[PDB]
């Protein structure tokens, strides 16, 4: 009996989740239906808003942190720190985020606009170095807690309680396959568990980068698909629930993102491109005719505008004429 | 089963426009008034203008004034109206041409091209008067071109009287003592106002303009930093007879307010939201507004304004920053 279109929210943390879903319209010329769950429509434009919500809300409820006193600490060069910052501002906690020096001014402003404290580590050390400084500050201060996004039990829990039930209602009980990229793995896992709760046997599909195919027989590498494919198996990912793995090149991911905008009005990030690519691969399978596939759009595209994802679109806008003496 | 975003699957992105959330302003409000913020920032391309694009396309199609694949939508705009018109072009299968001056950033031109809009750069020297003239030129050359016409169109206020107004009425359960909003085209103000008079609500209707360009108060058009409002003239769309009062807000008071909205309430938004909230808070201090409900609009999400004046001060802090030394393991 909280409805965002019908009611006034008490505060912005109440606007987390209950995200829309949209049929994939033009790009789908298969006989499968594809539902896109738009996590991009969360308040700070990331699925990670659900995770920050869970950490703060569940830690508070298990007496494990308190307003004014607690200090939330994380090493994150992505959206999790934005979301932690956001909920810090709303709920009255000091937040410290640790990240490599290579991060853009846009991604550091996003933290500091919410009052978070930054502490930067040298680029060559990367994320192992940030992880390092995070643990250092956490055990030095009696008031610090590490969020612990990759190992926390709050991660899959929140998706089993929110994202799952929502998709189930939104599709009215028709989900024949659920496809999602694995970052922390909480989205895939949390949703899968919900579907097993209600006796739905939808095929569960993980999506990984080709340039880092860790959930298969493959070694960690670099890839440009921000938010998924972290170079290991997360503790949070329940592997037994996963029926199938689909690898996507960065290139097939960027193509797909760019078409999503041009063809369907769905402005999103790299991970979204991968997920939809995977969805559409699955939809072309002959046994999937008349079935429903659900995937996730995890982030809105605006954060990724000055990145490889829209490099080709930035080619075409320079290479354009001014005009001079016409009126 | 009218459309509910939380419980339904939209047929396409245009069906997700409108039905935006509302949130009470909590920490920044040191008054005895309640302040409701209508979050137009939560539209699909993150501004209020998505409602206007929807209206133009949807009403023009229904009056036979345009046809898919045939008709070409044209507008001169260096702001969010262009993004919305682009978006709906992509979704509904129309060609869009946007004219703007050459001074526009690669970020703001990407946002258009990503939807396959056509761009036409006019010279920065001539600014917007120059873009406006090109747009009219293209429209008179091409029998299938249509000017979106954001400042003059009947569609603009209509959509706010049919959607924005009714939504606010349901969300506030009929408690609206004042509606305050910045005037770009004037359609949000006017459309909501008309709706409130339709249901017999006599809320005080408040326009907000930039202090440095106080045209609705008889000052002269001037420069200001408050993207979205203060066009430098009175739009035909604006019904001034419905407006009870005008409040001016400095660019600087608009920036401070937007920065606090983030820091203090988690509401990440642009300059015009800053202005609106500031104005709402000025009204809320009035003694006669004690225990009354003031509604305003957050028109756009903040991420588009990250490399602008709005967050310049915050970008100071993050560039002059320590790394830490040889001191990890
Ligand atoms: C976190 C993240 C995901 C993956 O979701 P998990 O909860 O980690 O499975 C996908 N892409 C982006 C953009 C992310 O921010
Ligand atoms: C256009 C717009 C407004 C003004 O709304 P109107 O309905 O056009 O008066 C305010 N701020 C921003 C950012 C907008 O894009
Ligand atoms: Cl006053």
Residue numbers in the entry:
A (entry chain B): 24 to 350
B (entry chain A): 23 to 351
What does the paper say about this structure?
The de novo pathway of cysteine biosynthesis requires the conversion of O-acetyl-l-serine into l-cysteine, which is catalysed by cysteine synthase (CS). Crystal structures of the three enzymes were determined at resolutions of 1.80 Å for TcCS, 1.75 Å for LiCS and 2.75 Å for TthCS. These three homodimeric structures show the same overall fold and demonstrate that the active-site geometry is conserved, supporting a common reaction mechanism.
In each chain of TthCS continuous electron density was found which fits the structure of the cofactor. Therefore, in this structure the covalently bound state of PLP has been captured. The PLP is located between α1 and α5. The holo form of TthCS confirms the residues involved in binding PLP. TcCS and TthCS both have PLP bound in the active site and therefore represent holo forms of the enzyme. PLP and OAS were not added to either protein during expression or purification and were likely to have been scavenged from the E. coli cells in which the protein was expressed. In contrast, LiCS forms an apo CS structure as no PLP is bound in the active site.
